[PDB]
Design a protein around this ligand. Structure first.
Ligand SMILES: C[C@@H](O)[C@@H](C)Oc1nc(Nc2ccc([S@](=N)(=O)C3CC3)cc2)ncc1Br
Length: 285
């Protein structure tokens, strides 16, 4: 920490506080994360593995600093998050080709991390970071598991909400699916204020799941036979004015059954991405 000069606080939550900071002697400008507490050894090993994990759509973890029995993480700094960018574009909306770029790259990031069996688990607009060049990257990949972390529910896959202890990479596709739809419509897709309300907002839109669409669902830990039975709605109603290609890909990203939910790899090949390009955004910094 004495090697770093804090500039401003840019975030807070699970893992504590995040600062924009300058390395007092290199001059490099970084994002510094102080982890919230010595540090268990399994957490050190796992975070060390994450440092290896380099890809253009993943926020580079530059340095792990474990000292005075605290853990600091030093990340590359990007200048804006997707939430602020969505708020600033709320009057016009983000152009579809930039949405498509951002989705494509984000699926590239997941594909990569998933091929290394690394899971995000807590995707949200504040974890997705952009630059002036038209790139977008995922921040905090693998932190949940490295740290054994057990509040925004809005992007939570139904299998987590119904009490699956052993969930898969499919939980990140679900989240990214809810973010895709939010970019398109300019409203959060499932804005739950509690876990049951989150679940029930999902059921009211996609239909109450059952054994036919999701084998095994009724035996899940927090499944209750007393759940109300709502009928599924048309995506044409959910995400106007996304085209049929985009709606087809979204529904596959929002399959109830995690084994039927599209992989990031397969999603990259979806016809929605046939005319993808890489626009640059208008960022006001
Ligand atoms: C993912 C989340 O904890 C974050 C904190 O981490 C990072 N944040 C950033 N940069 C950054 C994040 C937010 C904003 S913002 N849209 O202006 C916010 C309203 C103030 C600007 C830059 N760069 C690497 C990391 Br890692």
């Amino acid at each position: 920490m004495e090697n770093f000069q804090k500039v401003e606080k840019i975030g807070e939550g699970t893992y504590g506080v995040v600062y924009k900071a300058r390395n007092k002697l290199t001059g490099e400008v970084v994002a510094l994360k102080k982890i919230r507490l010595g540090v268990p050894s399994t957490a050190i090993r796992e975070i060390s593995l994450l440092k290896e994990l380099n890809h253009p759509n993943i926020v580079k973890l530059l340095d792990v600093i474990h000292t005075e029995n605290k853990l600091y993480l030093v990340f590359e700094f990007l200048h804006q998050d997707l939430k602020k960018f969505m708020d600033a574009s709320a009057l016009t909306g983000i152009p579809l080709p930039l949405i498509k770029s951002y989705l494509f790259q984000l699926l590239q990031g997941l594909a990569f991390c998933h091929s290394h069996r690394v899971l995000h688990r807590d995707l949200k607009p504040q974890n997705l970071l952009i630059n002036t060049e038209g790139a977008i990257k995922l921040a905090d990949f693998g932190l949940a598991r490295a740290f054994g972390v057990p509040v925004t529910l809005w992007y939570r896959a139904p299998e987590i909400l119904l009490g699956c202890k052993y969930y898969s990479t499919a939980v990140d596709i679900w989240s990214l699916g809810c973010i895709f739809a939010e970019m398109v419509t300019r409203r959060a897709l499932f804005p739950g204020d509690s876990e049951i309300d989150q679940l029930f907002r999902i059921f009211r839109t996609l239909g109450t799941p059952d054994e036919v669409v999701w084998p095994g669902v009724t035996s899940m830990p927090d499944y209750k036979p007393s759940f109300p039975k709502w009928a599924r709605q048309d995506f044409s109603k959910v995400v106007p004015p996304l085209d049929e290609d985009g709606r087809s890909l979204l529904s596959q990203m929002l399959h109830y059954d995690p084994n039927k939910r599209i992989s990031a790899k397969a999603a990259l090949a979806h016809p929605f991405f046939q005319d993808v390009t890489k626009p640059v955004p208008h960022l006001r910094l």
